[PDB]
């Protein structure tokens, strides 16, 4: 808590990047296309667009 | 002149010169006129000014410089020898002192004195290197009034500068003596020496 907005948003970007590389490295078999982040108060949602859900 | 007094008190000497005629600091541009032909349109005095500061855009066009006041061009030429770039204000003060001095000795219109100095320093023939397989000789050619005048100003300021440098005399004093010995064809000035040298060289190369 109590963090500047600049450093917060840079951290958001780094969070996005780390998740993206992570799902790239993990979900190769499953046809991973991309991600989306939706920050809310209480239940922050992460959508994952990939080919197969049977496997994901 | 019939003054107009006002809340800000504003001295009368200043209202006086203002609403009487639109002079330089103390110096009129009436009765001054170019002595020499070829040398109107290039040396331009018929608008007046107050002091020779102006941020104008003269380098854009080929010749809008020539519509610039010659004094502004002179000030602009002093700010060089790079310890004095951006020191056009210092130059204006130096020029102020110089006109005071050229009035002190030469009561005449010192603007006109300057005009005569320029027109007497303007080399009316100048050299160029022909291509010339071998020695690539020099060829005598004429020189436009504008380049003539520019080199004139340059020569005057450079002579004054090289005098004033390792010497106690101030840039205004050197400039004053240079303009004086140039307004007359005294042949004591750096400028007139160079004029004679170049012109005589041209005579040799024709």
């Amino acid at each position: 808590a109590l963090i500047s907005k600049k450093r917060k948003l840079v951290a958001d970007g780094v969070f996005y990047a780390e998740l993206n590389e992570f799902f790239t490295r993990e979900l190769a078999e499953e046809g991973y296309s991309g991600v989306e982040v939706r920050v809310t108060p209480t239940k922050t949602e992460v959508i994952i667009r990939a080919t197969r859900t049977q496997d994901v | 002149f019939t003054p107009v007094v006002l809340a800000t008190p504003i001295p009368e000497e200043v209202q006086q010169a203002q609403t009487e005629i639109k002079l330089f600091n103390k110096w009129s541009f009436e009765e001054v006129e170019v002595k020499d032909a070829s040398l109107v349109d290039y040396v331009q005095v018929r608008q007046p000014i107050f002091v020779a500061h102006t941020a104008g855009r003269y380098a854009n066009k080929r010749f809008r410089k020539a519509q610039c006041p010659i004094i502004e061009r002179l000030t602009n030429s002093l700010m060089m020898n790079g310890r004095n770039n951006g020191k056009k204000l210092k130059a204006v003060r130096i020029i102020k002192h110089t006109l005071d001095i050229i009035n002190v000795l030469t009561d005449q219109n010192p603007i006109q004195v300057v005009v005569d100095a320029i027109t007497n320093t303007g080399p009316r023939e100048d050299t160029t290197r022909v291509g010339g397989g071998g020695a690539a000789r020099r060829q005598a050619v004429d020189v436009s009034p504008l380049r003539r005048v520019n080199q004139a100003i340059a020569l005057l300021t450079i002579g004054a500068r090289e005098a004033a440098f390792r010497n106690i005399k101030t840039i205004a004093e050197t400039l004053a003596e240079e303009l004086i010995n140039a307004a007359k064809g005294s042949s004591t000035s750096y400028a007139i020496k160079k004029k004679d040298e170049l012109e005589r060289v041209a005579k040799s190369n024709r």
Partner: protein
Amino acid sequence: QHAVILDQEKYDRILKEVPTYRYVSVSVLVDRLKIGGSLARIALRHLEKEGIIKPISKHSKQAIYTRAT
């Protein structure tokens, strides 16, 4: 070399020769005479004192004077 003090003959010379000029200043003194330079400043003060010369302008770098009248 120039001179950095008076011998009273320079004192006479100044009052005798400077009114010859319609143009007077520091280096004018330092050339026509041989003066320590700072003393040309003091002398131009001494002729600002009374109407031996008439300053039409001055400055800290430079000073401008003339004939008495």
